[PDB]
DNA sequence: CAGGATGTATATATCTGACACGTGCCTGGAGACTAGGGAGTAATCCCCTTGGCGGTTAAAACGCGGGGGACAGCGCGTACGTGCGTTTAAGCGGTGCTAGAGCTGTCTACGACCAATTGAGCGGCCTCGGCACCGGGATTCTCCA
DNA sequence: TGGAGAATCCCGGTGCCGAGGCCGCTCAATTGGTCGTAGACAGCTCTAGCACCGCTTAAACGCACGTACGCGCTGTCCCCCGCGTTTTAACCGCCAAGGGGATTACTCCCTAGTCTCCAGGCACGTGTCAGATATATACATCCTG
């Protein structure tokens, strides 16, 4: 029999891995392309510094991590361990963003 | 550019949820997260381009992003 | 005798109200809320224009700083109609 | 006067004095108080027109704080502007969740 | 048998009554006594205007009502209609007060 | 004065929950709500008393309460 | 100099210049840059002490942003001071909920 | 030639670090974070002292305005030890 | 589905205090003039952003088996809603007293300002050691018999 | 409960680039007078806050009854996780233009400052009418049969 981990151990393993790391969790070029696509609807032919897209990526990943940290509390409050889009909507409308 | 919101991939949203402490992730979380990230980035990039075009520049510097974040109560340390 | 000379916004808010609703009045508590609203929006646009002048190492608040502060602070089409109203008033004023 | 040179109802001179004596910059341009008074008068006219419609729908002819609160919370842009703002004697918006209504 | 309303109808009647009114829902003298008792810990023999305690009562009732709306959303999220201290604690942790 | 937090009675907390849209209330809500109100009032009265004794006054005016609320992002219109 | 007259490491004259040129008040007193430099030096010494302890606990002799983030999010007073602040390349605190652990 | 004379707080933060932990150094990104932190709480204490001077119809920022701004902005025993440090420094500076 | 009971919206009187308007006056805003420096604009430099290319390789996409968790149904009890009667402070008005807020006047110490000087701090460069990475063993946790 | 396997931690060894210290220089901080307004302080007046008291009555409190909702249990199924395989695009190193940020020089126009005057706005009175309340009436809704 080949070895096989049970569902939830590797998830906790990568919780402990990514809560110990400091790196950026999104790839840099897709985020940079997304930033330039969003900025194309405000002013055409814009340039970005190398540190501007890094600042946007740090702020965006901190925002999304701190929103998932609240989504997880909203999921645990409903006696679940799965997060759902209604949990994200609840966290965003309790924070005062909708 | 067209439709780079799918460049925020499923394992990237899973890595951000693992850093957020999330054990199990529904399959509809990814399009919701992409829409949330797009709304956040629209608001910040709109303020950063306003700060940039006030200075009569064509380049969005890192200081424009830091000020655009600072006026949303999301102060960012490390970029001036 | 009289106490003190409070600079409120009440007569200008009353002129604006008489020009949008000529038969509607306003209470004193609602006039205090509108005065607090005008002071709050004033010191937010003025603080943001001050902050913009400080970022670009300028010493003057001009209508370009006030216009950028209005585009930063007001949401959506408020910032589209307020910039048009202010630009129209400045164009009229310099004539 | 400068309030009537620009066509405004708000005091351009008083806004100029508050910008000069308000510790905002070392110099204040001449079109800055005109622009700021025009923006303040527009933003006053919008909330006053919505409050007057909310007062007329309540069959009253005087604006009370309830009509200002209804005006600012029944409008997406004014609620985004005044999200972190409490209006005194204003109450709340009438809103019951759909789960609490009976079958 | 006399008349008797079912549990939940008069609750909805009070919801429609108090979401239509603008009064202060806490009594004035207990709230003013609570304000002077809290202010005793910061300065002895203080003094309050009549309008300062009304501004404190307006802000406190607005804070508690806007917290109870979030508490109701947290209760409804867990497929309940009763609000509980766990809903208050979740609403304050998501808003960022603890 | 001692123990005036019980002056925020159970019917007053029920009226504030009714204005908040709450249909059914547990019995342990009242002590949690009294603690939350005491924490809020402590932070606001502490800032208002700091503003008051900066001015070398002995009376907490409504302007000090308005400023103490304004510096916590809970700006209150109606009192100046 | 004024930095060494007061017993401080932070620049009292530069803080005085930034207060005089920051559009803060019409005049700036003499002891106010001294007080503000002393408060800035205390608040730097606290975060640097906690960051040096967190750097020594990871067996390192150099502060990286991770140690600053650990220093500020563990300390209650600094976490209330820096609640709405993102520190770049700081990560998060190691924190797993109790319901997610194996039973 | 040389570019420009960018003032920052890096050498004072380094002196403070070298008197608290004499063998621990700092990174460039951590020095940028500490510079942003010092500029941030400088702008908070200064913008609260400016408001305290404006609210009382005063035109001078004194150490009493800075002390009141420190007690308003810092939480708990930070505003006790920072007030004690600042009072000690102003006391020994006036001597 | 039907009718009684209860609550709430609606229409009329009546009464009060607050609001809309009128009046004196004063102080702050407007007009005119002068000086100087901030900023607008042109010109030049050189940094650093964008675009492209090619090999590596790690991450992403996709498919699949399975288990465990979400969700729905069901039952039980307890705790919370409703209502009634008793109690208790709140609210209101009326009065009195005085602390202190607010305003004015006078004086002086303190900060703005300006000019001369120099050393503190900043950019550049140079060196070496803390750390990132790599390979190998050691402990630790998980999972299935 | 224990052994196998996978994962993570530790422990030495190498290379490297970024921290840390030194050097030259320049510009901002310091020092010394001079002045003129801000504010500290004394004094005085008047508002408003605190304290008390009596009375009415509305809200709070306490209790009884019952229902409906929270919570625990069970069953089912389907969806998400772990893993292996194939693909794709990120990434890193290198190179080449060139756009535009950044700095300097210079001119000039716009705004601060001062002084003079007068009218717009504010405090204070004042009448009258919009709303608050009382009270009867009509419609809407809830609940139990």
Numbering used by the authors:
A (entry chain A), E (entry chain E): 37 to 134
B (entry chain B), F (entry chain F): 22 to 101
C (entry chain D), H (entry chain H): 26 to 120
D (entry chain C), G (entry chain G): 16 to 118
Text of the article:
One of the essential histone modifications, histone H3 lysine 36 methylation (H3K36me) is deposited by the Set2 methyltransferase onto the H3 tail and is conserved from yeast to humans. Set2 is recruited by phosphorylated C-terminal domain of RNA Polymerase 2 during transcription and catalyzes H3K36 methylation over gene bodies. In this study, we present 3.8 Å cryo-EM structure of Set2 bound to the mimic of H2B ubiquitinated nucleosome core particle (NCP). Our structure shows that Set2 makes extensive interactions with H3 αN, H3 tail, H2A C-terminal tail, and stabilizes DNA in an unwrapped conformation.
To visualize the mechanism of H3K36 methylation, we assembled the complex of Set2 and the mimic of H2B ubiquitinated nucleosome, the substrate of Set2. In the electron micrographs the complex is present in various orientations and in a subset of 2D class averages an additional density was bound to the NCP. In initial 3D reconstruction, with overall resolution at 3.4 Å, a noisy density representing Set2 domain was present near the DNA entry/exit site of the nucleosome. ~14% of the initial particles contained Set2 and further focused classification improved the Set2 density yielding a map at 3.8 Å (Set2:NCP).
